[PDB]
Amino acid sequence: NPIEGGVVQVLPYIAVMKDVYHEVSGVKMDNEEVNMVEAYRDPSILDDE
Amino acid sequence: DLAVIGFELDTRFTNTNRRQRGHLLQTRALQFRHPIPMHAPVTLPMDTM
Structure with a gap:
């Protein structure tokens, strides 16, 4: 939309971590x-x- | 000294009397145990609030 004038791409994802x-x-x-x-x-x- | 000195014969017994019973056949059974282990967890901590 002309009023929005831009876009943001949001990438949720799942990360593997260690307990440190x-x-x-x-x-x-x-x-x-x-x-x-x-x-x-x-x-x-x-x-x- | 060219001469025949000895011989071997392909003779055998006729088993009208069971002098020899030969190889034996019997049933067997084997058992393999495959217990299922429990593996290490994966944890997703979050705020209790």
Whole structure:
């Protein structure tokens, strides 16, 4: 619509994460936050023992 | 010294009397156990509020 004058594309998705605690220094976390869709190509994302 | 020295014959017994019963046949059975393990979970935490 001429009044809208633009569009925003919103991509919700499901991410696989590990349960990891924040570091005392910790400039960024090291949680392997990966889009679950990659678990089809790479099986190591979901390995759990 | 060219001479015939010995021989072997392809003779055998006729089993009118069961002197030899030969190989034996019996039934057997084997069992394979396949118990189903429970695997590690995947958790989706959320706010209880």
